[PDB]
Amino acid sequence: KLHKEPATLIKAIDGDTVKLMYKGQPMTFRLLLVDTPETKHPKKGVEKYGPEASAFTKKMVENAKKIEVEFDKGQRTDKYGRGLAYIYADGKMVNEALVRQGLAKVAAAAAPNNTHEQHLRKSEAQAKKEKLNIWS
């Protein structure tokens, strides 16, 4: 079963990436299962809803009392050394919150790291039906 663990906010980097202090070590965390419009995108730079997604993630982790990271069942870091996790701000999952607002799409999931895929797909479908942001 997945378990939440405490972390401390260091700095929000992008809509899909945040730097946190995890077990005494600063680390960059990539939000599992979501693709947000980038502002720091390698080949494109700033995409249409990127500053908005970026602002959303920043505000959410910045105003939280408690930040927790929840690793999935597969690998815990990607090839760039970033932690792969579901991040919670005062119990609310940031990954889901972005998708629910139409500020992120659900990424192509890779088992074993796909536990909350269906939950996220449900939020995306609602965001689509509401024509929010990305779906406007």
Curated annotation (Swiss-Prot):
- Which residues does the annotated region (Disordered) include? 116-136
Name its cellular compartments: Secreted
Give the Basic and acidic residues compositional bias ranges.
116-132
Active site location: 30, 38, 82
* Top-rank taxon: Bacteria
Q: Where does Ca(2+) bind?
A: 16, 35-36
By what name is this protein known? Nuclease A
> Which organism is this entry from?
Staphylococcus aureus
